[PDB]
Design an enzyme around this catalytic site. Structure first.
Site, PDB file in Angstrom:
ATOM      1  N   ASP A  78      55.687   5.145 -67.828  1.00  0.00           N
ATOM      2  CA  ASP A  78      54.825   4.265 -67.210  1.00  0.00           C
ATOM      3  C   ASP A  78      53.495   4.727 -66.706  1.00  0.00           C
ATOM      4  O   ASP A  78      53.513   4.934 -65.404  1.00  0.00           O
ATOM      5  CB  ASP A  78      55.712   3.378 -65.947  1.00  0.00           C
ATOM      6  CG  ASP A  78      55.027   2.151 -65.581  1.00  0.00           C
ATOM      7  OD1 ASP A  78      53.722   2.004 -66.079  1.00  0.00           O
ATOM      8  OD2 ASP A  78      55.873   1.237 -65.364  1.00  0.00           O
ATOM      9  N   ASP A  85      52.696   6.274 -60.043  1.00  0.00           N
ATOM     10  CA  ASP A  85      53.770   5.301 -60.034  1.00  0.00           C
ATOM     11  C   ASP A  85      55.119   6.417 -60.268  1.00  0.00           C
ATOM     12  O   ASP A  85      55.928   5.716 -60.863  1.00  0.00           O
ATOM     13  CB  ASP A  85      53.420   4.122 -60.828  1.00  0.00           C
ATOM     14  CG  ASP A  85      54.337   2.975 -60.567  1.00  0.00           C
ATOM     15  OD1 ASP A  85      55.342   3.131 -59.539  1.00  0.00           O
ATOM     16  OD2 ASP A  85      54.644   1.928 -61.530  1.00  0.00           O
ATOM     17  N   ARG A 107      62.690   4.659 -61.621  1.00  0.00           N
ATOM     18  CA  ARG A 107      62.719   3.710 -62.576  1.00  0.00           C
ATOM     19  C   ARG A 107      61.698   4.186 -63.620  1.00  0.00           C
ATOM     20  O   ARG A 107      62.090   3.602 -64.863  1.00  0.00           O
ATOM     21  CB  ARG A 107      62.293   2.341 -62.148  1.00  0.00           C
ATOM     22  CG  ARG A 107      60.878   2.377 -61.490  1.00  0.00           C
ATOM     23  CD  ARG A 107      60.696   1.144 -60.673  1.00  0.00           C
ATOM     24  NE  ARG A 107      59.336   1.390 -60.273  1.00  0.00           N
ATOM     25  CZ  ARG A 107      59.050   1.670 -58.851  1.00  0.00           C
ATOM     26  NH1 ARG A 107      60.172   1.803 -58.185  1.00  0.00           N
ATOM     27  NH2 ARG A 107      57.699   1.781 -58.441  1.00  0.00           N
ATOM     28  N   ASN A 108      60.929   4.925 -63.550  1.00  0.00           N
ATOM     29  CA  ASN A 108      59.700   5.601 -64.396  1.00  0.00           C
ATOM     30  C   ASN A 108      60.102   6.905 -64.970  1.00  0.00           C
ATOM     31  O   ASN A 108      59.175   7.459 -65.292  1.00  0.00           O
ATOM     32  CB  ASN A 108      58.544   5.501 -63.782  1.00  0.00           C
ATOM     33  CG  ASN A 108      58.161   4.003 -63.459  1.00  0.00           C
ATOM     34  OD1 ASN A 108      58.593   3.132 -64.265  1.00  0.00           O
ATOM     35  ND2 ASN A 108      57.235   3.576 -62.582  1.00  0.00           N
TER      36      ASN A 108
END
Ligand SMILES: */[SH]=c1/[nH]nc(-c2cccc(Br)c2)[nH]1
Ligand code: NA
Length: 309
Positions: free
Chosen positions: A156, A138, A142-143
């Site tokens: 994450d 992932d 954003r992570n």
């Protein structure tokens, strides 16, 4: 068959926290005062949302397992878990939030030195996860979290899978998946490797170099696999020399083994970071400048300076 995992899972008591405020929505920010240690550690507390769900708790403890087992300056670490009704992960406070929001908010003040340094730091984090036989599944802007503008960390581990001693690929079985960051072999055949993480690294670097644009914006996820099969890729960002864009395009090769290794991405982005204005062309680059209120801040220690045997 495989080395024992001797990571320590720290169970922390509710009397060790002074939850200062709330971040998101159940996300909170606060201070961890380990029982008589004369230290205050800025923390983010991820307390359970539904709270009624045995399924939710299995998943939270899977994240905690992975986060407790990683130790690298470019990877978020778990300080411990609080075993109250709602199972909370306690993690280092990353005060500038996710790198995606950070590049969107500060486009006008981000120079080439920061961007290429972030690319090196993420490649180092991802290279460390590979050494630990761990596939993230992932990776996205954003992570990645910002401790300081000079220092980011991958986060994450919700989808993270530990490859078996003899298992080079992981085989998934459906859900809500991040299609627009995924390698083609992962969308088609649910195959996931270090090399499919490299594809995601590529998309992440494109997010950074476009100051947080959405990949394949206004294209629905159902057609992404077809677009890629036809050989379409994300477009060359305006600031990117062919040198930088060629590295992204190599992360998006259909032959997984033809993509770069994280260790190579460290080398290539390091060379470019030694002469940044040669590799990224940003208007006003030479000018760019980038950088809490609790009663007593005297005994405050960052989690990174707080080590335990
Ligand atoms: S290094 C780190 N600090 N905060 C976090 C975090 C916040 C919110 C969600 C997640 Br998965 C991690 N990790
Ligand atoms: Na992936």
């Amino acid at each position: 068959g495989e080395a024992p995992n001797q990571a320590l899972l720290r169970i922390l008591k509710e009397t060790e926290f002074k939850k200062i405020k709330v971040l998101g929505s159940t996300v909170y920010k606060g201070l961890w005062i380990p029982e008589g240690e004369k230290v205050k550690i800025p923390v983010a507390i991820k307390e359970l949302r539904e709270a009624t769900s045995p399924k939710a708790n299995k998943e939270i403890l899977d994240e905690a397992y992975v986060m407790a087992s990683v130790d690298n300056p470019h990877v978020c670490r778990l300080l411990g878990i609080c075993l109250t009704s709602t199972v909370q992960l306690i993690m280092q406070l990353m005060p500038f939030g996710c790198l995606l929001d950070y590049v969107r908010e500060h486009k006008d003040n981000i120079g080439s030195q920061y961007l290429l340094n972030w690319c090196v730091q993420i490649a180092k984090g991802m290279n460390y996860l590979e050494d630990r036989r761990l596939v993230h599944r992932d990776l996205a802007a954003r992570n990645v979290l910002v401790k300081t503008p000079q220092h980011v960390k991958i986060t994450d581990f919700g989808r993270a899978k530990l490859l078996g001693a003899a298992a080079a690929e992981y085989h998934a079985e459906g859900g809500k998946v991040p299609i627009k960051w995924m390698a083609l072999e992962s969308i088609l055949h649910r195959i996931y490797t270090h090399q499919s993480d490299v594809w995601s690294y590529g998309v992440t670097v494109w997010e950074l170099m476009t100051f947080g644009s959405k990949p394949y914006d206004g294209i629905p996820a159902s057609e992404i696999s077809s677009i890629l099969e036809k050989g379409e890729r994300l477009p060359q960002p305006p600031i990117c020399t062919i040198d930088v864009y060629m590295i992204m395009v190599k992360c998006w090769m259909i032959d997984a083994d033809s993509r770069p290794k994280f260790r190579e991405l460290i080398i290539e982005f390091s060379k470019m970071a030694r002469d940044p204005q040669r590799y990224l062309v940003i208007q006003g680059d030479e000018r760019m400048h980038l950088p809490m209120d609790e009663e007593d801040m005297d005994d405050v220690v960052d989690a990174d300076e707080y080590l335990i045997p």
